[PDB]
Ligand binder design. Structure first.
Ligand SMILES: COC(=O)CNC(=O)C1CCCCC1
Length: 435
C-alpha cells in the first residue's frame, strides 16, 4: 500500500479492526520506511481513541483532545479532517506528506470531501500514496454489510414525533438503543417523549458531540438520540439501533439561497454506518436493527459537494492547477473547477468567515465574493422581507454593534444559520458583531 502513486481503499466491514489493528501496523511500516505521514481523524473523540491504539508509537497529536508531551522527532502527524483542510487554506506551510491515511473516509462534511480531493489529486500526480479507511466508500449500494455477530434486521414504522400509542416495541425494550433522527429539533421531540415515559436519554449533535459523548461512558442511559454525526466512528455499548432512515439535505436554490430540504432518505453508506453501530461484539448475537424507510442517492445535488469545490478552488496545489474531487464522488455536483477561486484579500475574508465567523461555506463565499470585509455586518439586516429570520413565530431581533435594535434579515439566506436554537443564537451573536 505504502508504495508511492497508490491510493488504497481499506474497505473491511464495520468493526473489522481497521482502527485498533490495521492502522498501528501501517504506522509501524511508515515509520520503518521513513515516510512523512498524516493520520486524519473525523472528530476529536476518534483522535482520543486513536491515541489509545497507537500508544507507544512516535506520533505528533495536533489536537488539544490529547494531552501528550511530544519528543520533537515524530515523522507521523495526527489531526482532524477539518484541521487538515483549514491548514491548507491558511498561509501556513503544510508538509507534502508521502503517506496520507484518512480514517472514516466516508465523512460527507465539506472539509472531508475537500481533503479527499486534494489527497487523491496528489496521488494521481504521482506525488504521494494514500489509504482511505471506510467500510462504505463512495457509491456503495449495500445497506446490510457483514458484522462481527448476526444482526436481526426489521423494516418497521418508526415514530418521528411524540406518541401516545402504537409503538409499544420502542419503550418495552430493556436494553440500550441508539436512535438516528433526521434533525436536532426532531430529536428534541422524541427525547422529550421518551423522558416523560421514564427513560434516561442522551442527545448527540455536531455542536455538542465531544461533551455529550462522554455521558455515554460516565452514566447509565436507555436511549441515545443522535443526528448523522454518530455514523463517523462513534462507538456505543448498545444492543439496538432504531433508524428513521431519514436526513435533511442542504440545497442551493437558484444559486441565491440555501434551504434544508426533507427529511428525505439516507444513502446506502449512511444506512450501513447507522446499522454498523450494533452487531460489533461476536459474543453477543441478536442485536436489533429497526429501519423506518428505504435508501436513495440523496448526495446528488447536496450542497456539501459544491462547498467542497469552493474550498479546493482556494487551496494552492501547483501554479494555477486546482485539485479535483475524488473520482467516485466527483459527479455529485455540476461545477467548473476554478469558478470559486478568489483573489488574495477576498480569500482571507472567506477563511475568516468560516473559522472565526463559524458560517457555512456557501454563506462565507457569498459575503467574501461580494467584497465585504469580515467585521462589516450590514448584510445581516439589508435583505428582502422574505429573508426575515423567525424566532418563536415572531421576527428575530438583535442589537447591532451601533446600538440599534434591528430585525435579522440577511442579504443571503442559508437555513443552516437558524436550523435550531443553538444555531440561531450563534448567528444573532455574529450579526451583533460579538465575534
Ligand atoms: C458542516 O460544514 C462545516 O463544518 C463547514 N466548515 C468547514 O469545513 C470549515 C472548517 C474550518 C475552515 C475551513 C472550512
Amino acid at each position: 500500500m505504502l508504495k508511492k502513486k497508490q491510493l488504497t481503499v481499506l474497505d473491511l466491514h464495520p468493526g473489522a479492526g481497521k482502527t485498533r489493528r490495521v492502522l498501528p501496523e501501517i504506522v509501524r511500516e511508515a515509520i520503518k520506511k521513513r515516510l512523512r505521514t498524516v493520520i486524519l481523524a473525523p472528530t476529536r473523540v476518534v483522535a482520543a481513541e486513536m491515541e489509545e491504539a497507537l500508544r507507544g508509537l512516535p506520533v505528533r497529536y495536533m489536537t488539544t483532545a490529547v494531552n501528550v508531551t511530544h519528543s520533537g522527532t515524530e515523522i507521523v502527524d495526527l489531526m482532524c479532517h477539518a484541521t487538515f483542510t483549514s491548514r491548507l487554506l491558511q498561509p501556513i506551510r503544510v508538509p507534502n506528506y508521502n503517506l496520507n491515511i484518512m480514517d472514516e473516509a466516508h465523512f460527507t462534511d465539506p472539509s472531508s470531501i475537500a481533503a479527499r480531493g486534494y489527497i487523491s489529486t496528489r496521488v494521481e500526480m504521482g506525488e504521494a500514496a494514500a489509504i482511505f479507511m471506510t467500510a462504505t466508500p463512495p457509491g456503495t449500494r449495500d445497506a446490510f454489510p457483514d458484522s462481527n455477530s448476526p444482526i436481526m434486521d426489521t423494516e418497521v414504522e418508526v415514530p418521528e414525533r411524540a406518541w401516545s400509542s402504537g409503538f409499544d416495541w420502542v419503550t418495552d425494550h430493556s436494553g440500550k438503543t441508539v436512535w438516528f433522527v433526521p434533525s436536532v429539533r426532531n430529536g428534541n421531540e422524541i427525547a422529550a417523549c421518551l423522558t416523560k415515559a421514564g427513560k434516561r436519554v442522551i442527545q448527540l449533535s455536531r455542536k455538542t458531540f465531544e461533551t455529550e459523548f462522554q455521558k455515554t461512558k460516565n452514566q447509565e442511559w436507555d436511549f441515545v438520540i443522535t443526528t448523522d454525526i454518530s455514523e463517523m466512528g462513534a462507538n456505543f455499548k448498545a444492543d439496538r439501533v432504531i433508524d428513521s432512515r431519514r436526513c435533511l439535505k442542504p440545497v442551493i436554490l437558484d444559486g441565491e439561497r440555501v434551504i434544508l430540504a426533507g427529511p428525505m432518505p439516507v444513502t446506502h453508506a449512511s444506512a450501513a454506518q447507522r446499522r454498523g453501530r450494533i452487531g460489533r461484539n461476536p459474543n453477543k448475537p441478536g442485536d436489533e436493527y429497526m429501519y423506518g424507510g428505504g435508501c436513495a442517492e440523496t448526495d446528488e445535488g447536496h450542497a456539501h459537494w459544491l462547498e467542497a469545490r469552493m474550498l479546493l478552488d482556494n487551496i494552492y496545489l501547483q501554479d494555477g492547477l486546482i485539485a479535483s474531487l475524488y473520482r467516485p464522488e466527483a459527479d455529485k455536483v455540476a461545477a467548473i473547477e476554478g469558478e470559486f477561486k478568489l483573489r488574495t484579500e477576498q480569500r482571507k475574508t472567506f477563511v475568516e468567515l468560516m473559522k472565526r465567523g463559524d458560517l457555512p461555506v456557501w454563506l462565507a463565499y457569498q459575503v467574501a465574493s461580494a467584497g465585504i470585509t469580515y467585521t462589516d455586518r450590514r448584510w445581516c439586516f439589508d435583505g428582502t422581507t422574505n429573508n426575515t429570520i423567525m424566532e418563536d413565530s415572531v421576527p428575530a431581533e438583535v442589537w447591532t454593534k451601533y446600538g440599534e435594535k434591528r430585525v435579522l434579515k440577511p442579504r443571503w439566506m442559508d437555513a443552516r444559520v437558524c436550523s435550531d436554537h443553538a444555531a440561531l443564537k450563534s448567528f444573532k451573536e455574529f450579526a451583533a458583531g460579538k465575534r
